[PDB]
Structure 1
Amino acid sequence: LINMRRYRNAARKLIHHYSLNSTSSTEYKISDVVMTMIFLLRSEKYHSLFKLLETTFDDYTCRPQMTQVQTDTLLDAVRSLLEMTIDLTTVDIMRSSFARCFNSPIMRYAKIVLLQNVADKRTTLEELLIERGEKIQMLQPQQYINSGTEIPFCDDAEFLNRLLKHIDPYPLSRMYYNAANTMFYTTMENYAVSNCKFNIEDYNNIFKVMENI
Structure 2
Amino acid sequence: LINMRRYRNAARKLIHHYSLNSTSSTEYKISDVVMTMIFLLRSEKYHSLFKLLETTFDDYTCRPQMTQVQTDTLLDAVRSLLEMTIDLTTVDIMRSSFARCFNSPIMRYAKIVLLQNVADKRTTLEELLIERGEKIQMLQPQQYINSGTEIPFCDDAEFLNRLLKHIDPYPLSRMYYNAANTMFYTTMENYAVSNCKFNIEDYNNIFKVMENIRKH
Instruction: With the length of structure 2 as denominator, give the TM-score of the two structures.
Output: 0.97
**Aligned mates of 1:147, 1:108 — CA distance in 2:** 60
Secondary structure in 2 matching 1:36: helix
Structure 1 stretches lacking a partner, 5+ long: none
Secondary structure in 1 matching 2:46: helix
Give the deviation of 1:119 after TM superposition.
Answer: 2.7
Give the deviation of 1:109 after TM superposition.
Answer: 1.2
8 Å CA contact 1:60, 1:99 repeated in 2: yes
Give the deviation of 1:130 after TM superposition.
Answer: 0.5
Give the deviation of 1:203 after TM superposition.
Answer: 0.4
Secondary structure in 2 matching 1:45: coil
Give the deviation of 1:57 after TM superposition.
Answer: 1.5
Secondary structure in 2 matching 1:44: coil
Deviations 1:6-38 (A, max 9, x none): 111111111100111111011100000000000
Secondary structure in 1 matching 2:61: coil
Give the deviation of 1:82 after TM superposition.
Answer: 0.9
8 Å CA contact 2:93, 2:118 repeated in 1: yes
Percent of paired sites with the same residue: 100
Give the deviation of 1:45 after TM superposition.
Answer: 0.9
**Aligned mates of 2:83, 2:118 — CA distance in 1:** 25
Q: How many residues align?
A: 213
Alignment match, 2:18: 18
8 Å CA contact 2:10, 2:35 repeated in 1: yes
8 Å CA contact 1:10, 1:32 repeated in 2: yes
Secondary structure in 2 matching 1:27: coil
Structure 2 stretches lacking a partner, 5+ long: none
**Aligned mates of 1:152, 1:187 — CA distance in 2:** 31
8 Å CA contact 1:57, 1:98 repeated in 2: no
8 Å CA contact 2:20, 2:185 repeated in 1: yes
Deviations 1:26-57 (A, max 9, x none): 11000000000000101111000000011112
Alignment match, 1:83: 83
Give the deviation of 1:89 after TM superposition.
Answer: 0.5
Give the deviation of 1:160 after TM superposition.
Answer: 0.6
Deviations 1:112-143 (A, max 9, x none): 00001113111110011010001101011110
Deviations 1:90-118 (A, max 9, x none): 00110000000011111111110000111
